[PDB]
Design an enzyme around this catalytic site. Structure first.
Site, short mmCIF file in Angstrom:
data_model
loop_
_atom_site.label_atom_id
_atom_site.label_comp_id
_atom_site.label_asym_id
_atom_site.label_seq_id
_atom_site.Cartn_x
_atom_site.Cartn_y
_atom_site.Cartn_z
N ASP A 273 48.25 32.95 50.39
CA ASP A 273 46.80 33.01 50.40
C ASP A 273 46.15 31.63 50.45
O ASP A 273 46.83 30.60 50.46
CB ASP A 273 46.29 33.78 49.17
CG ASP A 273 46.68 33.11 47.86
OD1 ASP A 273 47.72 32.43 47.83
OD2 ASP A 273 45.94 33.28 46.87
N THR B 285 49.78 44.14 41.84
CA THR B 285 49.56 45.08 42.92
C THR B 285 50.62 44.90 44.00
O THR B 285 51.30 45.86 44.39
CB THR B 285 48.16 44.90 43.55
OG1 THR B 285 48.23 43.91 44.59
CG2 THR B 285 47.16 44.46 42.50
N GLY B 286 50.76 43.67 44.48
CA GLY B 286 51.72 43.34 45.51
C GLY B 286 51.20 43.52 46.93
O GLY B 286 51.93 43.27 47.89
N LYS C 200 42.61 35.75 54.78
CA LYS C 200 41.46 34.85 54.82
C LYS C 200 40.66 34.94 56.14
O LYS C 200 40.32 33.94 56.75
CB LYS C 200 41.87 33.42 54.37
CG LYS C 200 41.03 32.22 54.81
CD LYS C 200 41.50 31.57 56.12
CE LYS C 200 42.89 30.94 56.04
NZ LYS C 200 43.17 30.22 54.76
N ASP D 193 46.16 54.82 13.27
CA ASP D 193 44.91 54.73 14.07
C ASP D 193 44.85 53.61 15.12
O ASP D 193 43.79 53.37 15.71
CB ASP D 193 43.71 54.61 13.12
CG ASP D 193 43.71 53.33 12.33
OD1 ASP D 193 44.80 52.75 12.11
OD2 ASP D 193 42.61 52.90 11.91
N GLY D 194 45.97 52.92 15.36
CA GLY D 194 46.05 51.93 16.43
C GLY D 194 45.46 50.57 16.11
O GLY D 194 45.09 49.81 17.01
N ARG E 282 43.12 34.24 34.63
CA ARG E 282 42.33 34.21 35.85
C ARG E 282 40.84 34.03 35.62
O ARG E 282 40.19 33.33 36.37
CB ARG E 282 42.60 35.42 36.72
CG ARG E 282 43.92 35.30 37.46
CD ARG E 282 44.42 36.64 37.96
NE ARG E 282 44.45 37.61 36.88
CZ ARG E 282 44.87 38.86 37.01
NH1 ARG E 282 45.33 39.30 38.18
NH2 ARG E 282 44.84 39.67 35.95
N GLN E 283 40.30 34.64 34.57
CA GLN E 283 38.87 34.53 34.29
C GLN E 283 38.54 33.17 33.62
O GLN E 283 38.68 33.02 32.41
CB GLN E 283 38.38 35.71 33.45
CG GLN E 283 36.88 35.70 33.15
CD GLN E 283 35.97 35.45 34.37
OE1 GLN E 283 35.92 36.26 35.30
NE2 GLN E 283 35.23 34.34 34.34
MG LIG Z 1 47.88 40.94 44.29
#
Ligand SMILES: [Mg+2]
Ligand SMILES: [Mg+2]
Ligand SMILES: [Mg+2]
Ligand SMILES: [Mg+2]
Ligand SMILES: [Mg+2]
Ligand SMILES: [Mg+2]
Lengths: 308, 308, 308, 308, 308, 308
Positions: free
Chosen positions: C169, C224-225, C193, C36-37, C95-96
């Protein structure tokens, strides 16, 4: 190592026995009461850096024995004990573990578990918890040792008849089938567990084939003993040759002795996780096996090997 | 009050239903994933001072659903939620609750309980925990609601035959006798539970008198469904008229649907604490009762009356 | 010492490599799923008194990998592990870490940190946290290892052209200038930016002199890239000879492979803190350096020396 | 509500101002020292059940001001304060938030956060934390208010020239681009950030087109003022018409006044989160905006609405 | 062992002395301030696995000295210190330990105790706490060493006259009778402690027979010195030959030196748990005994023997 | 409000009296024992959202009474009690509060304080703690009410002779001088407190002028009563007219009654924080004042005003 064993006043006879089998003696500590019934504790030897084990069941007097333990733990932590292992052969308050139908009841087994955490316990031993989930009530390692090897051992040691294994109630059926299997199963049996409606009478009816079988009742504990008497007579009604009642914990509150001497059970056999009263001591039905050796090995193995 | 209901993605259909019966709607919140499978949460309305209820079972996907919940709780606390009530109809990881024979296993039900505490849960609802002791695993109030009223209700709603109640295994005997009694008991029945030795075959043998009786199997949950199939066929072998399989939680992992369509059970009846898969949805055997109304009342009653 | 290494299923290839360089093997433990995971864990060897290290990135499947870790930690503590060191090469949910403008968002990096504390982690390794402040999110020692030595090493190993270093960035400018300096700086560069207003287009404009320079983009991670493609094309528009994209963590969620094979980047070079998918594995642009040796040394040095 | 405002001795002028705009006065409390420099506190009014707000920046004298706060929190909790909200306009020790290269440094911002938790803070306000992640250092809601509305407001209020926005360093580039965008961007600019090797000289070189532009430097804080002087002169070297230096927190430790009166900055504009020294008070360059109104609204809105 | 001694800036002269008697030197650590009066700490040597002792009284500057300690503890824990022992010869804030008449005062001694726990202290040494109950304020072992052996030692070393022992106030009567007994008691004496009503004058009246006796005043501490001056003159009024004033902690806040040089006390003798100011240093009345040797032995004995 | 009063079995007569003066009755709750001496608790009414007060001294049977309280607190928290206020008129284990000379003793007063925290107490009332510092042992508000108003009241109510106030020992001198002052002081007196060496005899010698004075002994408590008898006879030896012995807590462990009927004290007057035994009840010397009214006011004032 720096292994030290201390004992409060709950199970002093048993604590000595575990000490004997580990070829050491109980550490020097005054554990008593003041005149007003507050517990007095003094550890009268250096525990600094020591791997200490407090052997103390939380049995009747339960709160008194619990408090002794708790306060012995506090004194040893503040005395720089390296590690504190609470060895509670019989875990008091084990039965209270839920709030059925949202009853406004305490979960006192969890309360004790908290209280032990708080005061600085690093690990616990107990034998045969009422529900194993209590291991979860703690936030700390808990080794819940089964006292069934030694029971089965004794069961074999006599043997000499049929026999089959019997759950004295609805709740012990898990515990009983296990011991059935561990033996050369067969067999099994369960008990009513049958009200309504008019007369609050019990036992009502058994399930299973007990014709001329020489029976073996088994449960985690004995309190009162009404539970097992009413199963013994019901067994015997179906031609059961001899009813032997085995269990780990010998509580024996409220009129248990009278029930047992008025019982139809040929022999009752219990482990030494709770000291027997004078009444029960003065009874031929009963015979106690020691978990001393079991407990010795387990607390040594925190030398540290695993269990097994 | 300032009662708000939020739902993650574990049980959205059920969450809506509880909302309908409480004549409100689900609060605005984005609950999804980022591209990389980390959960994204944003509470898109003011919860400051609010008495909030998060309706979310911790079912498959279990960790994903658990994490959603946990992180929704974090966001609401940091957003000054007055009080957070986690309503987990099906408590994931409930089965793992002990360390038998000192197996080096986690007590993951306790881990979840901790994790929920930590993140700031003030209370939990769940329906039919696997062991009620889990209420002790928490340090916070827990109302463990029984979904058996509604089951019995349905059982009556059909009635129209004999009938007697049957425990599909060793462990459910407690659960089954209760429902036996709650009905007009009789009756009872238990299943083997019988290896050793050569062939790992099962079921072996039943106890109880099922001659021409129209049976009712009952358990807390269904996983795989091998458990209940092997009991159904064994029942039917003893002339059981119709085998109805009732349970609260419809897990149905691993080949359950095939087992059920290959089963001999006339009807399986389950509550809606877990969404049914397409496979099971596409099955005539099965029919789901709602705990929506039960859950609505319970979360209103934290208005605040007691339960009952 | 009593050093043991265990691995879950997040980074098994990497865990083996760290084991190879420390001339030991991965401890015996079943880490999987039930039907069941829900995660199943069993430590199949004695960890009592051991200094154990759990090597497991918290990467996709993130919650699944996190839960594995968490529950492995619980099992080892309850099994009397002497000390538990969590080695999380890629710290999921990093990140969060804030609630910008008082968004009703979770600080899920802190939640994980709590959850790890709670379950009994005594120390963590991670490589290149998204923000180093996460070291503060813990209440326990945290060694945040830089994977930039080995990157620079490789950058030199090729050399053979100009070159200068480029921040893809606004946020990586700190990270990029460092690597600029660590090299024989020059040089530097930043990217827009630049919205508002009409068309949500990007990249807009670079700052810095990239005439015929053979560039080196560098960031902590790749997801994503799109981030790096849009910087690569913009670089190339200003006559940049070759754009090499370096980063530690190769996430590559959502259409990253397509972006990379449609990119203008001559080579992308990443560390092995996250296993590469089949898609990315089947790509000539990409080449992975190992942090195996770095991680080996760091976890040995908890023998215990310092870092350096 | 039962809203009470108390102030220690860190920011008494500001505390009064927030009180004025909320049309109440500061609660009666003796906050001083004993003869030996231990803080004396007595809350001289009933706070039982009250929603209390302690307005006190943790600025120089930092430990003294911190301890005042901490001990005021203890006294109010023990006095049955309903809820304690710490309003720390300038969060002392904010910069120390990591252990770069595993330096054996404290994460003192986290230590303060713990210490505040421990003593019983239920929520904090601060304006413009050095890193927002500090919100994660707490286990409790934190509203980190931006003092940039009011800055931009003032920037407009003068306007009357070009202008563009300038990051005085590597680390403020995030903060600066934001204010660039919030204005009618253009524009942007960054500063070196350029050693090695022989002479530890700075500033070295700017990036961006400052021909005849009337500049606006912006940062979170000012300490020493060397940071901004060396950027102002460098700006002016490129024909910058007027250099206006904006920031929230006016620390001004160590020779700042001399630097500012020796600076080339036409006006420096700072918020009132830290009282200005006599030196700085006696300076024509400088002018302070109030966050009194901002802070008033934020602490009222815990009436309780959200922010916005 | 891996015993390391570190010192902050509260008691550096004393820390060196304890180091001398333990034949080691103070560990490498930068402990200072930033330009803005926040404490800077860096442990400049490997403490990993070490049994470290931080020698630092929490005396004037109290908060500054407290914060130094606290932050040194944080840095060492995060640096994997094996165990942290805080040796605070003079425990700052010791007097504030209750909320008489439910005064809305902090229990700041408990706050410090919490704060020390929180930051990770494993044990504390202090000499002569103002109330011993403070040992209870901690959740961790605390050895409260008496500096009275060494005082009595000195008292004997001079002897050469009568003498008797005198409590300078209501509260020290316990402390004084002890030292009376430890000497060849006799004798005893107490001081008023006598307002109302018109004139707030003091001292009023002594109890005990001081005819021609050569007196010995004794207290835990000296602050201001008004306490002991007003007792000395009152003693002398009853023909007391020589008044010697002994105490452990030499606080000497607010005009103490003037009081002492204007006093009638022949010699004042104090231990070195607090550095003496220049004023007091420049005084013939005063003479300091060292607890260096006492403290050395106590921190060695955590080698680990007991105390004694 | 939603104020509810519950009582365990420690002080039921007193609990009723506080209920009478607050014009309500004691909430429905079964508080007893099981057959085996584990406490049974069931709250038989809805406490959800309620402001509940548990009136229960922790007096002999101390552990039993403590455990009752603790488990009543657990049940009420799990039953969603809004707030839990423990009213412990006599705080058991109050005397054990330190580890003199590093005795390996528990600080059991702190242990209780922890245990109460843990189980979820939100505030405590107690009357006249043995040391007020115990207020610090808690992490939660504690109102330590003085029962001396009512004593002085009674002292006046009789008056009719001299009189002066007398400390029965070294430790009560603080308590006694206070009551001396609160009366129209004069006067004062202290007792030996005089071994060594040969015969462990006591009392030895008084200080103060008791010629024909009609005395008033006062202490916090009475245990055994040897303390006060030996002071009474010593008083009377110096022509003391009548010796009245006042104290708050009437413990009276171990042969106290015999001591009191063999005493020379004309009247002993005690408050009702501990139920009197049959022996003491059957004694003409003794007379009890009620703190019922005092306690009523204090627990109402958590309506919520301050104290005063
Ligand atoms: Mg990215
Ligand atoms: Mg029984
Ligand atoms: Mg199944
Ligand atoms: Mg600066
Ligand atoms: Mg003084
Ligand atoms: Mg006595």
């Amino acid at each position: 190592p720096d292994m030290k064993l201390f004992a409060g006043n709950a199970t002093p006879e048993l604590a000595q026995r575990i000490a004997n089998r580990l070829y050491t003696s109980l550490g020097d500590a005054a554990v008593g009461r003041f005149s007003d019934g507050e517990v007095s504790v003094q550890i009268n030897e250096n525990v600094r850096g020591g791997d200490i084990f407090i052997i103390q069941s939380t049995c009747a007097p339960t709160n008194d024995n619990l408090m002794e333990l708790v306060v012995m733990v506090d004194a040893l932590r503040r005395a720089s004990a390296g590690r504190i292992t609470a060895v509670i052969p019989y875990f008091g308050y084990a039965r209270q573990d839920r709030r059925v139908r949202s009853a406004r009841v305490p979960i006192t087994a969890k309360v004790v578990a908290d209280f032990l955490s708080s005061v600085g316990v690093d690990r616990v031993l107990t034998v045969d918890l009422h529900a194993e989930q209590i291991q979860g009530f703690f936030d700390v390692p808990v080794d819940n040792v089964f006292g069934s090897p030694i029971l089965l051992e004794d069961m074999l040691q006599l043997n000499l008849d049929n026999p089959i294994v019997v759950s004295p109630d609805i709740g012990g059926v898990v515990r009983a089938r296990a011991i059935a299997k561990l033996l050369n199963d067969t067999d099994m049996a369960i008990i009513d567990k049958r009200r309504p409606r008019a007369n609050v009478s019990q036992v009502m009816h058994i399930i299973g084939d007990v014709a001329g079988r020489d029976c073996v009742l088994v449960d985690d504990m004995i309190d009162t003993g009404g539970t097992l008497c009413k199963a013994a007579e019901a067994l015997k009604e179906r031609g059961a040759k001899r009813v032997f009642a085995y269990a780990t914990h010998p509580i024996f509150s409220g009129n248990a002795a009278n029930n047992l001497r008025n019982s139809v059970i040929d022999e009752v056999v219990v482990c030494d996780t709770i000291p027997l009263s004078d009444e029960i001591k003065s009874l031929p039905n009963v015979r106690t096996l020691t978990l001393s050796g079991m407990l010795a090995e387990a607390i040594r193995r925190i030398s540290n090997e695993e269990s097994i």
